[PDB]
Amino acid sequence: AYTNSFTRGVYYPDKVFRSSVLHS
Amino acid sequence: FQPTNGVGYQPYRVVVLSFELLHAPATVCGPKKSTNLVKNKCVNFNFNG
């Protein structure tokens, strides 16, 4: 069986807080 | 390992301390003391290094 990983799998790459920003 | 062996072949004990620097809360700190906190004034802060 197979399924679609729509948008899941994103995890905090760093243990530092950020706010209202688009970080690459 | 024999006591008569050359120093190059003599046994050496090795310990490697590995630590990752500041990215999260910490539990191993040095002997530094602490001080009270003051707000609304320009100060030199040192939070966990």
User: In this complex, how many residue pairs, one in chain A and one in chain B, have their CB atoms less than 8 Å apart?
Assistant: 4
C-beta separation of B24 from A15 below 8 A? yes
Q: Which candidate, B19, B26, B31, B17, places its Cα nearest to that of B47?
A: B26
Documented resolution in Å: 3.4
d(CA B48, CA B25): 8
d(CA B11, CA B2): 9
**Method by which this entry was solved:** cryo-EM
The chain A residues in contact with chain B (CB within 8 A) are 14-16
State which residue of chain B sits closest to A16, comparing Cα positions: B23
Tokens at A16, concatenated:
């530092």
